[PDB]
Motif scaffolding. Structure first.
Motif, PDB file in Angstrom:
ATOM      1  N   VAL A   1      32.896  89.409  91.539  1.00 13.99           N
ATOM      2  CA  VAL A   1      32.391  90.366  92.522  1.00 13.99           C
ATOM      3  C   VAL A   1      33.496  90.766  93.495  1.00 13.99           C
ATOM      4  CG1 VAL A   1      30.842  90.616  94.487  1.00 13.99           C
ATOM      5  CG2 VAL A   1      29.981  89.737  92.300  1.00 13.99           C
ATOM      6  N   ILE A   2      34.234  89.785  94.015  1.00 15.13           N
ATOM      7  CA  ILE A   2      35.309  90.093  94.949  1.00 15.13           C
ATOM      8  C   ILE A   2      36.395  90.897  94.253  1.00 15.13           C
ATOM      9  CG2 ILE A   2      37.036  89.118  96.494  1.00 15.13           C
ATOM     10  CD1 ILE A   2      35.125  86.650  96.782  1.00 15.13           C
ATOM     11  N   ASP A   3      36.708  90.538  93.001  1.00 15.74           N
ATOM     12  CA  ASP A   3      37.709  91.280  92.247  1.00 15.74           C
ATOM     13  C   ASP A   3      37.345  92.756  92.184  1.00 15.74           C
ATOM     14  OD1 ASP A   3      40.133  91.160  90.439  1.00 15.74           O
ATOM     15  OD2 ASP A   3      38.669  91.945  89.015  1.00 15.74           O
ATOM     16  N   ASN A   4      36.074  93.049  91.918  1.00 17.61           N
ATOM     17  CA  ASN A   4      35.630  94.436  91.871  1.00 17.61           C
ATOM     18  C   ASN A   4      35.706  95.107  93.241  1.00 17.61           C
ATOM     19  OD1 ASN A   4      35.089  94.489  89.099  1.00 17.61           O
ATOM     20  ND2 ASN A   4      33.014  93.702  89.378  1.00 17.61           N
ATOM     21  N   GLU A   5      35.450  94.362  94.320  1.00 20.85           N
ATOM     22  CA  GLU A   5      35.655  94.914  95.660  1.00 20.85           C
ATOM     23  C   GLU A   5      37.081  95.406  95.823  1.00 20.85           C
ATOM     24  OE1 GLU A   5      32.650  91.515  97.534  1.00 20.85           O
ATOM     25  OE2 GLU A   5      34.701  91.674  98.268  1.00 20.85           O
ATOM     26  N   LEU A   6      38.045  94.576  95.427  1.00 18.63           N
ATOM     27  CA  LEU A   6      39.445  94.933  95.597  1.00 18.63           C
ATOM     28  C   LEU A   6      39.820  96.126  94.727  1.00 18.63           C
ATOM     29  CD1 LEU A   6      39.328  92.279  97.097  1.00 18.63           C
ATOM     30  CD2 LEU A   6      41.560  91.724  96.132  1.00 18.63           C
ATOM     31  N   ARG A   7      39.309  96.180  93.498  1.00 18.95           N
ATOM     32  CA  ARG A   7      39.605  97.333  92.659  1.00 18.95           C
ATOM     33  C   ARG A   7      39.129  98.616  93.322  1.00 18.95           C
ATOM     34  NH1 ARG A   7      39.845  98.669  86.617  1.00 18.95           N
ATOM     35  NH2 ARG A   7      39.310  96.487  86.154  1.00 18.95           N
ATOM     36  N   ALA A   8      37.990  98.552  94.006  1.00 20.36           N
ATOM     37  CA  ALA A   8      37.430  99.694  94.722  1.00 20.36           C
ATOM     38  C   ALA A   8      38.155 100.020  96.024  1.00 20.36           C
ATOM     39  CB  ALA A   8      35.953  99.426  95.008  1.00 20.36           C
ATOM     40  N   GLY A   9      39.132  99.222  96.436  1.00 16.91           N
ATOM     41  CA  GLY A   9      39.802  99.449  97.701  1.00 16.91           C
ATOM     42  C   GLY A   9      39.124  98.828  98.901  1.00 16.91           C
ATOM     43  N   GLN A  10      38.130  97.973  98.682  1.00 16.02           N
ATOM     44  CA  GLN A  10      37.434  97.289  99.767  1.00 16.02           C
ATOM     45  C   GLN A  10      38.192  96.003 100.049  1.00 16.02           C
ATOM     46  OE1 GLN A  10      33.057  96.881  99.630  1.00 16.02           O
ATOM     47  NE2 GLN A  10      33.481  94.697  99.963  1.00 16.02           N
ATOM     48  N   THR A  11      39.219  96.106 100.883  1.00 13.06           N
ATOM     49  CA  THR A  11      40.159  95.012 101.068  1.00 13.06           C
ATOM     50  C   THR A  11      40.193  94.489 102.491  1.00 13.06           C
ATOM     51  OG1 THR A  11      42.008  96.511 101.512  1.00 13.06           O
ATOM     52  CG2 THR A  11      41.588  95.930  99.216  1.00 13.06           C
ATOM     53  N   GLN A  12      39.334  94.987 103.370  1.00 11.68           N
ATOM     54  CA  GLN A  12      39.347  94.590 104.769  1.00 11.68           C
ATOM     55  C   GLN A  12      37.920  94.478 105.266  1.00 11.68           C
ATOM     56  OE1 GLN A  12      42.915  96.426 107.268  1.00 11.68           O
ATOM     57  NE2 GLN A  12      42.030  97.962 105.890  1.00 11.68           N
ATOM     58  N   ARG A  13      37.777  93.896 106.458  1.00 10.73           N
ATOM     59  CA  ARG A  13      36.469  93.810 107.088  1.00 10.73           C
ATOM     60  C   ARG A  13      35.898  95.189 107.396  1.00 10.73           C
ATOM     61  NH1 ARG A  13      38.019  90.830 110.485  1.00 10.73           N
ATOM     62  NH2 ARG A  13      38.467  92.109 112.340  1.00 10.73           N
ATOM     63  N   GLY A  14      36.754  96.148 107.712  1.00 11.03           N
ATOM     64  CA  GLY A  14      36.259  97.449 108.103  1.00 11.03           C
ATOM     65  C   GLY A  14      35.686  97.392 109.505  1.00 11.03           C
TER      66      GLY A  14
END
Ligand SMILES: [Cl-]
Ligand SMILES: [Cl-]
Ligand SMILES: [Cl-]
Ligand SMILES: [Cl-]
Ligand SMILES: [Fe+3]
Ligand SMILES: [Fe+3]
Ligand SMILES: [Fe+3]
Ligand SMILES: [Fe+3]
Ligand SMILES: [Fe+3]
Ligand SMILES: [Fe+3]
Ligand SMILES: [Fe+3]
Ligand SMILES: [Fe+3]
Ligand SMILES: [Fe+3]
Lengths: 178, 178, 178, 178
Positions: B165-178
């Motif tokens: 799940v986290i790997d897919n977050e990173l692929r999507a560019g979701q790499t920070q808290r925002g």
């Protein structure tokens, strides 16, 4: 101007052992196609819709490769000989086992091309090595892709939750490392 | 008009200890780059495609930071001295362990900048502290980001499903808290 | 399905001498990168802004080539081994001398690829020769380009006026015969 | 609420030595402005139209910097004291000599800011150091730019042909390394 075995004007004669090897390789492509169709069905039977869609597309791709080879034989004025096609494997105990067979099928498709390639080099058939070069390049990418899918499924370690996540990746078209 | 050590017109002389410190820091940036390249490879070898893409981008970013520092030395009319670069660490037992090394690398990059900063203040080199200020600001954000990625991976507690799940977050560019 | 040295599913084993040769070549690409960075700096120190921009881009390109090779080893399920990187040459008496070193670096990068290519042919590794083919093609164009830049600089015969004209050509992106 | 020396509400009192230093620095900015106006004229008199346009813009920029400082004193509720302005230097034997004076003027403008900065730090006036930080950053870029223009003119070595080429660069807005 001489006529080749399929009746067209002949640019350069082809060694019959090389012709036989290419005709056999076309069967390998067709067998990869029906194998991926069988795999698509196995996944569909288990509601793995993303894997089903992936393998459905791979089946069509392998068939297109087979046709691409038939066109090369036409271009070389050589006879095609479409062969009897074995039934595919159809049963697997797990998705990981299916994916191992898929990777093997992809690697074996490359080995077949390599075998044709070596025979062409032995016969100094530079048309054939040039024809095969981009296909080997595509195979590298497909082997990398299938190693990625197999490795990701093995990482899941049989957990249905992880396999559902990967299934959804495939449905979305996320099928490679990128 | 005086000429600086690199031959350009010299706006203000620089203490040789500060120059040496900046040249050493450029090596730290370059070493961070190749470390993140090594980490990208480690993730790619394990089909962690999102982590691979993330670290591939971080490697390029750190290299850009190194070049940014070389441009500052050019601007100060100081010599650059590109150094031998150590091989990176390349082996880790887990993604959590890799992410701990990554966080450490990011914090150590900041510590190096802080060391240069203190030396500049000792030498009253306000050009250098002004040059470094926005880089420290960027480091705060990168440390926050790497603490986020490390903490999220540790939260997963080695569960492959959560790591996918986290790997897919990173692929999507979701790499920070925002 | 066998696992390769980097742990991924293995499509075909690779001879360890060929693996070592590829890992060494990755170092050559990385060394070309830092050499062009050093050259970019040398030009920037002499206000040759067009040459600086050109070599800055070449440094990034060579790094991308190195990464491209690391991805091939991943695809072949082979281990990467990122090595210590020598310091580049950093001093030249003239732009003509720098450009001669640049041409040599480009030709030596090709020679390294050719060495890997010959080893792959000795081992019948057709994946590797296919992988290298487009890189050799790119090298022909880069050698032609660097011969063009070196020859144009030598034609200038050390005249600053002519070197300023060429510098402006490079800033504009006019870097080849076209 | 206390009223500051210029009559506005006072957020924090300012040391009179720091106030004097800022008022003096405003004169330095204004003097840089009229110096670059004089340089623009010298270039126009010699048909160096690109250098004329460049220095015309620099004169307006330095004036804007002076106004920016007057606005800071207004913001700190401090009195402005616009001073008598010396006549600029107006005669040079060569463009290279003019460009050396220009570089010196730019470096001396930074030294003045640094002097104000040190006095603010001695007085713990963090508003003033924060106000000056981006101006020092801009000065680094201007020093790099003026080192570039001076170095490129010196490279020309008095050749009118090369100076015409550089003149056309400046007319086109090509005034930095990029
Ligand atoms: Cl499974
Ligand atoms: Cl972990
Ligand atoms: Cl030269
Ligand atoms: Cl001159
Ligand atoms: Fe195929
Ligand atoms: Fe296939
Ligand atoms: Fe950095
Ligand atoms: Fe960093
Ligand atoms: Fe700041
Ligand atoms: Fe390269
Ligand atoms: Fe190259
Ligand atoms: Fe100013
Ligand atoms: Fe200025």
């Amino acid at each position: 101007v001489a006529q080749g075995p399929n009746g067209r004007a002949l640019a350069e004669s082809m060694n019959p052992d090389l012709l036989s090897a290419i005709q056999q390789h076309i069967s390998i492509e067709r067998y990869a196609s029906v194998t991926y169709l069988a795999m698509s069905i196995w996944c569909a039977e288990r509601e793995l819709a993303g894997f089903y869609q992936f393998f459905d597309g791979e089946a069509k791709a392998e068939q297109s490769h087979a046709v691409h080879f038939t066109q090369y034989l036409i271009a070389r004025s050589q006879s095609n000989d479409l062969q009897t096609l074995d039934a595919p494997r159809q049963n697997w105990d797990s998705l990981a086992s299916l994916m191992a067979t898929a990777f093997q099928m992809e690697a074996d498709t490359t080995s077949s091309i390599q075998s044709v390639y070596a025979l062409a080099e032995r016969n100094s058939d530079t048309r054939t090595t040039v024809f095969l070069d981009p296909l080997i390049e595509a195979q590298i990418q497909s082997e990398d892709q299938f190693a990625y899918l197999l490795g990701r499924v093995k990482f899941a370690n049989g957990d249905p939750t992880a396999l559902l996540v990967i299934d959804n990746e495939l449905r979305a078209g996320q099928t490679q490392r990128g």
